[PDB]
Amino acid sequence: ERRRLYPPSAEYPDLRKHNNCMASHLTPAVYARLCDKTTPTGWTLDQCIQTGVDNPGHPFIKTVGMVAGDEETYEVFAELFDPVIQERHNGYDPRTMKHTTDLDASKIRSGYFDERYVLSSRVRTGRSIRGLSLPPACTRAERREVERVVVDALSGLKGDLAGRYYRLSEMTEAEQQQLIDDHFLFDKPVSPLLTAAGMARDWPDARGIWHNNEKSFLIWVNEEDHTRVISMEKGGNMKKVFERFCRGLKEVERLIQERGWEFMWNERLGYILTCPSNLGTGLRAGVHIKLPLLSKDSRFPKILENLRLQKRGTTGSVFDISNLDRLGKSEVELVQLVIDGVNFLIDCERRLERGQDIRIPPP
Amino acid sequence: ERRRLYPPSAEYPDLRKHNNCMASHLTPAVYARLCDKTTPTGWTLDQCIQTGVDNPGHPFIKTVGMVAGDEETYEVFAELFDPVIQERHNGYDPRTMKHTTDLDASKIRSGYFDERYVLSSRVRTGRSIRGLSLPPACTRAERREVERVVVDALSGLKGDLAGRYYRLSEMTEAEQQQLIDDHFLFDKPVSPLLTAAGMARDWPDARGIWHNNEKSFLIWVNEEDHTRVISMEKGGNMKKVFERFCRGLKEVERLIQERGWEFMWNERLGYILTCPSNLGTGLRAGVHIKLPLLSKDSRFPKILENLRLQKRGTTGSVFDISNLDRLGKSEVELVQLVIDGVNFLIDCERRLERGQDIRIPPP
Amino acid sequence: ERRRLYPPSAEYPDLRKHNNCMASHLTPAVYARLCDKTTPTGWTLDQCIQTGVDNPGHPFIKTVGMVAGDEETYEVFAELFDPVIQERHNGYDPRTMKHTTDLDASKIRSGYFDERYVLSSRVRTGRSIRGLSLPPACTRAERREVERVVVDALSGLKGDLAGRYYRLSEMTEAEQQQLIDDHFLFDKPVSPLLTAAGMARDWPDARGIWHNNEKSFLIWVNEEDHTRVISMEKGGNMKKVFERFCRGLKEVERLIQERGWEFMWNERLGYILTCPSNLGTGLRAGVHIKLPLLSKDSRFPKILENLRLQKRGTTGSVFDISNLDRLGKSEVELVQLVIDGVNFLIDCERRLERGQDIRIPPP
Amino acid sequence: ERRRLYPPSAEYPDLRKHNNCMASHLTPAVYARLCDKTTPTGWTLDQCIQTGVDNPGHPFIKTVGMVAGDEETYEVFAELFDPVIQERHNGYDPRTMKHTTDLDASKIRSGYFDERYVLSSRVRTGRSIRGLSLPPACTRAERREVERVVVDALSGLKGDLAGRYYRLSEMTEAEQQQLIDDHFLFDKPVSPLLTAAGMARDWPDARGIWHNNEKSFLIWVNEEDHTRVISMEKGGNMKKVFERFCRGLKEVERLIQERGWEFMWNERLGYILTCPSNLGTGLRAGVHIKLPLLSKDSRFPKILENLRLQKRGTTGSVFDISNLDRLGKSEVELVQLVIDGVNFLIDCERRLERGQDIRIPPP
Amino acid sequence: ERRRLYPPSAEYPDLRKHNNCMASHLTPAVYARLCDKTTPTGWTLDQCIQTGVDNPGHPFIKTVGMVAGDEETYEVFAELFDPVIQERHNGYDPRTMKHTTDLDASKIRSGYFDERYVLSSRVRTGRSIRGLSLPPACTRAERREVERVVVDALSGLKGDLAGRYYRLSEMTEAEQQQLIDDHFLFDKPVSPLLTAAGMARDWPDARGIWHNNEKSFLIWVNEEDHTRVISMEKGGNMKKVFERFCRGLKEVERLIQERGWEFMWNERLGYILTCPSNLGTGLRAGVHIKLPLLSKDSRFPKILENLRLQKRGTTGSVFDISNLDRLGKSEVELVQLVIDGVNFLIDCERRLERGQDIRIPPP
Fold first, then answer.
1. Residues near B227 by Cβ (< 8 Å), separated by ≥ 6?
2. Closest CA to D78 of D268, D262, D231, D235
C-alpha cells in the first residue's frame, strides 16, 4: 500500500544488558536483512530470538539464546545462526565443513570402567521428524502427530528392546510415583529459557514416556525435542549401553522409514535439533563417578578441560562427567573420547590413592 | 493447492482436565468456525486460548484463560469471547446491552471513612491505545510506541499532577530500592498465566513507572496492559482520590487526543483491555480495612458478597476490599457501591464493638 | 506480512497551532478511517490535507486547507470533506440537499448599472474535464491532455466568440508584455497554499491563455483549475456579459461533448472543482465600484454582509464587490443577487450624495 | 487490463528552457526505462525529477535538479543518477570507483590559522538514518521517528559535548530570539527548489535544534536532511573543531547503533544524503576570512579554483571559503585540502601586504 | 500502478458523421461506464461497436452498427444494447417485457397462396450454440466445434429431412457449380459491415452447407451466425414449409440436447443471435410475388407498411415480401401476419385486375 512499515531497526531488541550468544552475534544489519524472511512453515526471526531477548543471561554461564522451529530455520536464517554455531561448537564451520555421522557402534574398543569408581553410565541423544515442526513452533496437531509416529514405531519393538508407553495426559498417580522413584519421569519445564522459547506449551498434551521392560531404554516424547533417547545402566560398562543405544536408534529409524517418516538430518549440521547447542549428534555420554581425592585438587577442572570433558552435579564427591563437542565429531569418536577421559581420570585417582604423581594430558 | 490441511478438530486442545472459563465455553464447532479467522493485525484463536490451554486452572479459583491482542479480537473472535464475558461479568450481555461510561466524578457523595478503620484508599484502572496492539500481541516497536506516547502525554502535566518517569531499562539501584520501599515498582511477571499469555516478553524493554511528586499518582507502562493508573492515599478519603484519578485520566486523554492518539473504547465493551475479566471500566477501588471482630464472624464473607464486595490479602485482620463488576456499571456507580459497602462494614464493626446486632443487607 | 504498519495516529499531523477548516474538522477517528482509503486514481488523504498541514493559517482569515485530485475524492474521502463544505458554504448539506444548475441566462432581468458608479463588470467561473485528474493530482500527460481538449474545442469558435490561444511555454516577450498590459496573463503561483497543494508543478508546461478578438472572453488553462472562464467588460452592463458568458460556456460544453469529453458535474456538489470552497457554480460575479461616501461609513461592511456581498481590493475608494455562496444557489440566482446588491449600494450612494437616510436591508 | 496506459514519452517533461543537470542528463530512453520502476518504499522517477522540472534554473548557476527519497533511489534509478553524480563531482565514477571514509581525525596536522585573518571556523556535514525515508519522501511518522532517534541518542551525551534540544513546535519566543541572535535557528525553507522537492512539508513538525552548552556543537533535525551537524568556533583553530566534530559524530553513531539504528552508508556513494550534490562526506569546512588586498586582485577567483576552493558571502572583504569535492576524497583529506588552501591564501595576503609577488599554485 | 490510463473519453469514437443506431445511442457517459467492463469470454465494448465506427452508414438506410460475441454481451453491455433493441424492434422493451417462443406450428391456419401469384415460399431463421462464442468473437477452435456439433446432430436425420453436408474447405468445383445453380451456396462476405464486425475471419474454414435430398432444407454453418436454417419450396404453400421448418428445428434441438449442447436462448431477448436486429425469432418468412398492377400504384409501399410487411429485390414486378418484427411476437404469430399480408395483397391485385377499388388496411 502507501502506508509505511515500522523500520527494521524500530523492532531491534535492547541487548545492552544481555550476555547470550544471540545478543553477541546480533547486529542491526543482520536483523534488517532477516526481518522480512520467513520459513515456509511460518517461523520468523523474532520468534527465533525471543528466548535470547527475554533472558538476558548471566556472566560465567553463557547460553545460546536461540531456538529453531523448522529445518528451513537453519537455512532461511542461516546468516545469524552460523556464527552462533561457530562460537558454540569450538570453531566448527557450517559454511564449508561437513558433519560425519557414524552410528555403527562396531568401532567401540575397550572402555570398561571399574565398578567402584563408576556407579552409572548413560548414552543420550535427541531426534526429530523431518515433516513436522520443532517444539518451539509445532502446533498441537504436529505434537500429536510426532507422538503417534513414535508410538507406532516403538510398538514394533521386540527382544530386550521391549517396553511400554505411558501418556502423561492419563498417567495414573501410582505409575507416576513409580516413574519418579525410577528418576525417569520429566516434569513441566520451569526454566525461563525453555518457557520463553515456547517448549512448554500445551502441557502435558502429546507428552509421553516410553520405558523398556529392563529399565534400560528410555524415550521422552516432545518434552524439549521430538524424541530424547537414553540408554542407561548401573555400572561402568560403556560398550553394552552404546550397542543397546545404537541398536535401538537404528531399529527406530528403520521402522519410521518403513512407515514413511524420516529423521531430520543435514550434511552440514548433522541431526537437526531445536537448540543450536545440541547439533550434529546431540550425544551426552555421561558417567556418575566418585573421585574425592581428585576433586580435592584445584587442577582437576583444568585437567578435565584438557581432554574436553565437563563436570556437573548429580554432591558427596559424585559428579556427572560428559563430553563437550556435540557437533563436528563422529558419535563413536565422541564415545571413544569420553571413555578415554574417564579411564584417564580413573588412573589419576588410582595414582592419587597410591600417592603417585599424575601427568597432565595435553589440551 | 491439492494437499489437505490438518482438520480443525486435529488442532483442538485437550481440555478434559481444565477448569477455566475458556475450556468451559470452548466447543469443537466454535473452534472449527474460528480456526481460519484472523484479526487484521495477525492474532489467531490459538494465540487467544494459549493461556487457558497451558494453565489447566484449579477448582475454587476459576480464571478466564483468554487474552486479546487487538481491538478486532473482541470482534473477529466474538463468538467465543461473548459467553466468557457473560459468565465473568455476572450475566452482562455484550450482544445487546451497551456499556455506559461516566468519569465525571461530580456525582460522588459522602463516602468519607474513619481514619482508624481505613488505613489506605486506592482507585485503579487500565487504559490502552487504539492504534497499537495489546501486550499479548504487541511487538517491540509497538511497545516502544505506547511508552513514547504515554511519556510525551505525561510530560505535559502540571499542578499537583506533576511527577517524573523512570525506565526500568536504566533504573539505577538506589531509585529501584526507594521505589520498592514505596511499594510502587513492579517486578517481572512470574504467574504462569501471564507468562503463557505473552505479557512478559522483552523484559524490561519499554517498561516504565511514572511517579507523582506527591506520591499519589502512579502509572505503570505496559507491564500487564498499556497503562495502569492508580490514585492512592493513606486514609479513608475516597472523594479526593476519586477526583484526582478522574482529573488525571481526563488530562491524559485530552493530551493524547491533542497529540493524535485515542484510547481503546467500544460501546458494547467499554474500555478495551487485554484480559476479558477487566472490561468496561477496569476499576478496582480498594480499601485496606482492619475489622478483627467482623473477620471473626463466619458470616462475614456472605455479607460481603451480598453487597458485591470481595476480600483479598494485603494478615493481622487487615484486608483489601474491592468491588466485583468491572463491566456493566458506571465508574461513579462502582465508586458509590464500594463506598456504600465500606460504610456498611464500618457500622457493622461499630455495632460489634458495641455488641449491637447487625442486619444482613439484601443480596 | 508479519511486520506492523505505523498506527494511523502515528501519521496524525500536529494541528495545535492551525486555524484552517481542515484542521478544525479533522479528528483522529476520521483520519484512522480514511488513512487506508484511496481514490481509484491514487489520491490519498495525506495528499488531500497537505495544503492545510503545511499552512497553519491566520486568525480573521480562515481558509479551507483541503484540495481534491479526482471526482472520487469527494466520494472516497466524503466523511471529512462534507463538514468542510458545510462550514464553508453557510450550512449547505451535501448529505441530502441537491444542487441545481441553471445556465440558461434567459431569466436575467434589469441589472443595468450606472456608468459613473461601475467601471467594469466580470463574470468568472471554473470547469474541469471528467476523465482527467485535478491540478493537485494531475500528471504531465493529463495536463497536456486537458490543454489539448480545451484548445481543440475553442478552435471551433465563431462569431463574436472568436479568438486565439497563446501557450506560456513559447509565449514571446512582446505578446507577454501586451497581455500584462491587458491584465490577462497569469503568473506562476506564489501563494504558499497553492504551492503546497501542488497547483504549481511543471510550470509553465501545458499552461495557456485563450483571448477573444474583442478582448471580452478570457480562458485560463490549468493554472489553478482545468479551465477558468471570464467574460468582462468596461461598464455596468451585467446582462451582456452574462449572456456572453453563458453562450461561451454552452458552446464549449457542446463542442467537448461532440469531441467526446464531458465536464465534471455531480448532483449533490454541482460543478466539481479542485478547491472545496469553489463548488457548485464557482461564480464570482464582480464589480469595480467607486463609492467614497459609502466607504466612509463604518456600517458599510455590515450592510454589504446583509445582502451576502463581499468587498476586496482591485484603493482610491474603488473596490471589487462579489457574491458569497458559490454552492447551494442557481447561477442565475447568484447573478440576480449580486446585481440586486449592486443596485442597492448604488441607490444608497445616491442617497448619501443627496444626504438622504439609507434603510439597512434585512440580513 | 485491455486499456492502454499513457506512453512513457507522453509524461516526458518539457526541458527545452531548463538549465539544470537533471534536464541535461535526462533522455527519452532513460525516462521510458525508469518510468515503471519504483523504490520499495514508493518513490518514483517523476518525484525524483519534480524539483528539476519545476525549477528551470539559470545560466552561470547550475543546480542538480534531483532529490532522493530512499537508499534504493540511488539504485532503482541508478541509470539516471550516475551521470548526474559524474558531472557534479568532477568526474567521480559511481559505477566502478569506491568511496573511502576516514573520520578518525588523528591524521590532521598543523592547520592553525592567524586570529586576525580568520574570524570563525566551521566543520559541517549531514547524516541520515538507514531505516527511514529521506526528507523529500518521508511521511510525518518517519519524520517523528528520526527526531525521536536523534533526541534519544543525543540525550546520552556528556563531557564538553553536552547540551539541550529545542523543538520548533513549542519553541518559546524568548529562546527563539536568542537562537536567532546566536545565528543557529533555521527558518522555514523559502527556496523554490527545496519547496518543489518537498523538503518543507509539515512545518515545523518534528523539526528541532540541538545546542551544546559551550555553543560549539549544533544539530539541525530534518530541515533539509535527517541530521545536519556543525562544529564551529570563533577563531582559526581547525584542529580543535575537527576533533570535536569527529568525537561527536562517532559518539552519536555508537549511541544509535547501541539503540539499534544505523546511518545511511554505501561503499560506492559514501554517506547517503537527499541531494546528490552532497554525497560521500557532505563536508563543508568553511572559514570566514577577511583578505581585502587579495579580493581586490581579479586573479583571486582563479587562484582559489586552482586549489579547489570556493568563495561565498557571509561583504566588507569578509568571505566564507569552502572546499568543493564532497564525494571522492576522504574527510581528513578534505580538511587537509581546505586548511592548505587557507594557509596559501594567508601567505599570499601577507605577501600582498608586504608587496611581495605571489606564485600561482598549480590547478 | 502509478501510471495513468487513457481517459475513457480519449477512446471515444468520432461519430459526428455517422448515421447508425450505435452512434445515435452512444453517449460519453455510457462509454465511460462500459469501457472497463468485459464479458467473461473477453468481448469488449470497442469490439462491440467497431462495426458501427468503421461504417458511418447512409441516410434513408439505417443500420444497427453493433454486434455481439457472447451471451453475456447482451448482459455485460446491456446499458448500451437495450436502447438499440428498443429503436430497432419498434419499441420492444427488454428491460421489462418478456419474449414468448411458440415453435409448435400446430396453430397455422389457411394461408395457401395462388400458384400464379406466388412463385416461391421460404421460412428462414438462425440459431446459436450456448457454450460457444458468436461469429464476431469466436476463435478457430470454437468455429470448428460449432460445425462439429451441427454435423453430428444433422447426421442423425431421417425421413424427408435427409441430406448431406458439404464443406467449403474441400468443396469440389462441380458440386460448387451445382450449388450455385441451386442458389444455395454462400460466398465470402463482402459487405463492409460484416467484414468490420469480424464475421469473415478464417474463410472458408469450418464453413459448410447442409443440403436436403429433396432440396427443401438448407443449413448454413457459421457464415453470419452459427446456424442459418431455411425451408423453401416453389409455390405458395406456407403451411408445408412451416411444418417442415418446425419439425427440422425441433429435431435438431432434441438431437443437440441429447448430445449435450443447447441453443442460445434468453427469456427477455428470445433466441440470441450475433446481430441485435435479428433477435427473438430471427424469422424472415419471405414470398416471391409478382404484382405488376399493385407495384404501379404509388400507395403500395404505404399499404405494405400498414400490415408490417417490407419489400426487397429478388426486377420484372417480382419482389420478395417479408415481415418486420423479428422480436416481440411469437413465431406462429409472425407466420400468420405474413400470410395475412400476402393474402391481402393477393386480393388487392385481384381487385386491380378486375378494376375494383381496394380498401387500405389499418396501420
1. B126, B127, B128, B146, B150, B219, B220, B221
2. D268
Experimental method for this entry? cryo-EM
E292-327 core/surface letters (b: 16 or more CB in 10 A; e: else): eebbeeeebeebbeebbbbbeeeeeeebbbbbbbbb
In 3D space, the residue among D85, D137, D77, D125 whose CA is nearest the CA of residue D101 turns out to be D125
On the CB side of C66, CA atoms within 13 Å amount to: 29
Tell me how far CA of residue A25 lies from CA of A65, A87, E295, in angstroms: 10, 9, 105
Nearest CA in chain E to D38: E2
> Hey, how many other C-beta atoms are within 10 angstroms of the C-beta on B266?
16
From A35, which residue of chain C is nearest by alpha-carbon distance? C3
CB distance from A188 to chain B under 8 Å?
no
State the Cα torsion C6-C9-C14-C15 to the nearest 10°.
Answer: 150
Please report how the helices D238-259 and D331-354 are oriented relative to each other, as an axis angle in degrees rounded to 10. 160
Q: Does any CB of chain C come closer than 8 Å to the CB of residue A39? A: no
Query: Whose grid coordinates read 504549481?
Result: C200
Q: Are strands D309-312 and D318-323 parallel, antiparallel or unpaired?
A: antiparallel
Q: Does C13 touch chain D (CB under 8 A)?
A: yes
Angstrom distance (rounded) from CA B360 to CA B297: 13
Burial class (CB in 10 A: 0-12, 13-18, 19+), A340: middle
The span from the CA of D264 to the CA of A7, in Å, is 13
Contact present, E128 and E299 (Cβ < 8 Å): no
Distance (Å, rounded) from C-alpha E52 to C-alpha E31?
14
Rounded to an integer, what distance in angstroms lies between the CA atom of residue A105 and that of residue A200? 34
CB contact under 8 A, D5 and E3: yes
Contact predicate C39/C76, CB 8 Å: yes
Cell matching residue C132: 482527467
| Nearest by Cα to B310 from E178, C145, A136, B319 | B319
Q: Which residues contact E144 (CB under 8 A, 6 or more apart)?
A: E205, E206
Of D2, D3, D44, the CB nearest to E2: D44
CB pairs under 8 A between A and B: 55
Touching partners of E (3+ C-beta pairs < 8 Å):
C, D
Tell me the C-alpha distance between C64 and C326, whole Å: 14
Q: Is the dihedral of CA B55, B58, B61, B64 positive or negative?
A: positive
Q: How far apart are CA E31 and CA E17, in angstroms?
A: 18
Confirm if B103 and B331 have CB atoms less than 8 A apart: yes
| Residue C201 to chain D, least CA–CA distance (Å) | 6
Cell numbers at C213, concatenated? 478578438
Between CA B342 and CA B123 the distance in angstroms is 14
- For residue A81, the one-letter residue type is F
DSSP assignment, residue C276? T
Q: Which of E2, E6, E36 sits opposite D38 (nearest CB)?
A: E2
- Tell me if B149 sits within 8 A of B169, measured CB to CB: no
Closest-CA residue of B relative to C2 is B42
Check CB contact of A37 with chain C, cutoff 8 Å: no
One-letter amino acid at D146 equals V
DSSP state of B349: H
Nearest-angstrom CA–CA distance, A320 and A114: 15
Residue C62: count of CB within 10 angstroms of its CB: 14
Rounded CA separation D230/D235 (Å) = 15
Task: Report the alpha-carbon distance of residue A274 to residue A272 in Å, rounded.
Answer: 7
Q: Return the CA Rg of chain D.
A: 21
Q: Which three cell numbers stand for residue E15?
A: 461519430
Check if the beta carbon of residue C165 is closer than 8 Å to that of residue C208: yes
Q: Is the separation of the CB atoms in D64 and D26 below 8 Å? A: no
